[PDB]
């Protein structure tokens, strides 16, 4: 059924699975019109589809032209997500197709199940985890490629860089969610943490900085402090 704390290690077994997050598919800026009414202007979006075992990120960029002349965009966005995920599975060789697709919001279940009727043996699942994938646009290299796109476009990233050379998937996933949780709670502080020391750089071919094991422990500690802090500043404790 749903995915939660009790079955957490299933993410890192050898059954191919994808997380799909739709929270940045339809993005808008709300503004005032000359008449003093309110209007929205859409900006480019993305589907965040992630293999938590390997780090492969299928970032499907959603160009604002896909909304032109459409109604009920929030609802259409779920179906467009589903249509693009289904197109991706079909593009993958059989032995690469996921056995399960986990959606980070339940409103995606029906749109995805309908689009994947041709794949009766792929399980579509929800999750009880509150995953911070909406913060994926706080990663500079991903935001940049999304905002620059002039047409629909898929770019294939590895969200873990080469961490899997040194750490297991479970630990890599835990680092990733701690980084994203931090960027979602206080983006400026989080980014300050990751880039204060000019001697640690982001490789041209890497999303995140080149931290040693020791520096990563320091970093990870600093992000937990941030998340507990902001939880005080927010709740006054």
């Amino acid at each position: 059924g749903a995915m939660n704390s009790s079955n957490y290690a299933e993410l890192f077994n050898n059954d191919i699975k994808l997380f799909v997050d739709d929270t940045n598919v339809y993005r808008v800026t709300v503004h005032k019109t000359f008449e003093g009414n309110v209007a929205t202007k859409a900006i480019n979006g993305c589907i965040f589809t992630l293999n938590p075992k390997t780090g492969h990120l299928f970032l499907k960029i959603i160009h604002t032209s896909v909304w032109a002349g459409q109604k009920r965009l929030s609802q259409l966005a779920k179906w467009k997500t589903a249509e693009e995920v289904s197109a991706l599975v079909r593009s993958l060789p059989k032995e690469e197709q996921p056995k399960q697709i986990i959606v980070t919001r339940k409103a995606m279940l029906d749109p995805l199940e309908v689009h994947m009727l041709d794949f009766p043996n792929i399980a579509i699942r929800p999750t009880e985890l509150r995953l911070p994938f909406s913060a994926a646009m706080s990663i500079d290299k991903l935001s940049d490629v999304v905002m620059k796109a002039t047409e629909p476009q898929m770019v294939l990233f590895n969200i873990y860089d080469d961490w899997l050379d040194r750490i297991s998937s479970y630990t890599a996933f835990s680092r990733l969610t701690l980084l994203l949780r931090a960027l979602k709670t206080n983006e400026e502080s989080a980014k300050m943490i990751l880039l204060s020391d000019p001697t640690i750089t982001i490789k041209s071919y890497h999303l995140w900085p080149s931290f040693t094991d020791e520096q990563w422990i320091t970093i990870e500690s600093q992000m937990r402090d941030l998340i507990l802090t902001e939880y005080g500043r927010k709740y006054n404790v």
Binding site: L76, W79, E83, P111, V114, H115, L117, D118
Partner: protein, 300 residues
């Protein structure tokens, strides 16, 4: 007017004849039911006093043969049979009527209730839902499952209703995934009406028969079938005007006839609120919404 005689009544039993019912005591001198209106299907049904488990019964049309009831002490139920010897049968019936051992089907002359609940129900179609081709009448009970239920186990004792499934390839055209899931008109009009049922009358007939098996036998699969067929219409943006008006009448009488105390298990809260208040047809079931709101405002 026709007659279903009873050989005897050896066990205490509540006997239903359409929407009527009466109590017969163990070995009371009861020899059946007379004055049954020709022109309609009918259902005669049974709940034993000792074991209220297993409501069961028989759908029949008296134009199709002379039928009677005989208790079977081995199988332990009242069985319907056909008498082929017409003279034997007329003679038997006449004797039982002269001795006044028959109850009279008690139709009030103002009352169109049974007609309104069976308007589109034909015996020939019942016999395709309930497969037992050596008999002209059809046995149904509380526990029989549907074809779709057995897919999610004895196929001979099944109810072969038309499978409806909103998340199926039949229901969803490649490339119209969102459109067809949010507006089921394609599935209603092309797949089901034109393709499977041929016309709206056959569709309404399955719907009515499903409701009747749910109400008289508490058959749970039938209740799923009735709600499914309603929801498919309500969830289609494009429905012929005549079907909508007829649908409102049909459901009106079904809601009117449902025992008040059985509403908690035979009425699906999600389907009704959706159908009356959210769906494309939320404004098109005036009679049905007025009776639902005055009779079962709780559900809503």
């Amino acid at each position: 007017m026709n007659t279903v005689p009873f050989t005897s009544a050896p066990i205490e039993v509540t006997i239903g004849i359409d929407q009527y019912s009466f109590n017969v005591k163990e070995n009371q001198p009861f020899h059946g039911i007379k004055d049954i209106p020709i022109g309609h299907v009918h259902v005669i049904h049974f709940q034993h006093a000792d074991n209220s488990s297993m409501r069961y019964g028989y759908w029949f049309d008296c134009r199709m043969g002379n039928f009677y009831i005989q208790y079977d002490p081995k199988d332990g139920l009242y069985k319907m049979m056909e008498e082929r010897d017409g003279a034997k049968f007329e003679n038997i019936v006449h004797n039982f009527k002269e001795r006044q051992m028959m109850v009279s089907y008690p139709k009030i002359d103002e009352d169109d209730t049974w007609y309104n609940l069976t308007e589109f129900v034909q015996m020939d179609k019942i016999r395709k839902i309930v497969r037992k081709d050596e008999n002209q009448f059809s046995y149904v009970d509380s526990s029989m499952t549907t074809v779709q239920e057995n897919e999610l186990s004895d196929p001979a004792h099944s109810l072969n209703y038309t499978v409806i499934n909103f998340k199926s390839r039949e229901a969803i055209r490649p490339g119209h995934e969102m459109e067809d899931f949010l507006d089921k008109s394609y599935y209603l009009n092309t797949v089901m009406l034109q393709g499977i049922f041929k016309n709206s009358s056959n569709y309404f007939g399955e719907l009515q028969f499903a409701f009747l098996n749910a109400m008289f036998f508490g058959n749970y699969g039938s209740s799923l079938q009735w709600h499914a067929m309603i929801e498919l219409i309500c969830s289609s943006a494009t429905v012929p005007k005549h079907m909508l008006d007829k649908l409102d009448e049909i459901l009106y009488y079904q809601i009117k006839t449902l025992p008040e105390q059985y509403s908690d298990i035979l009425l699906n809260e999600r389907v009704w609120n959706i159908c009356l208040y959210s769906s494309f047809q939320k404004n098109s079931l005036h009679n049905t919404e007025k009776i639902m709101e005055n009779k079962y405002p709780e559900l809503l």
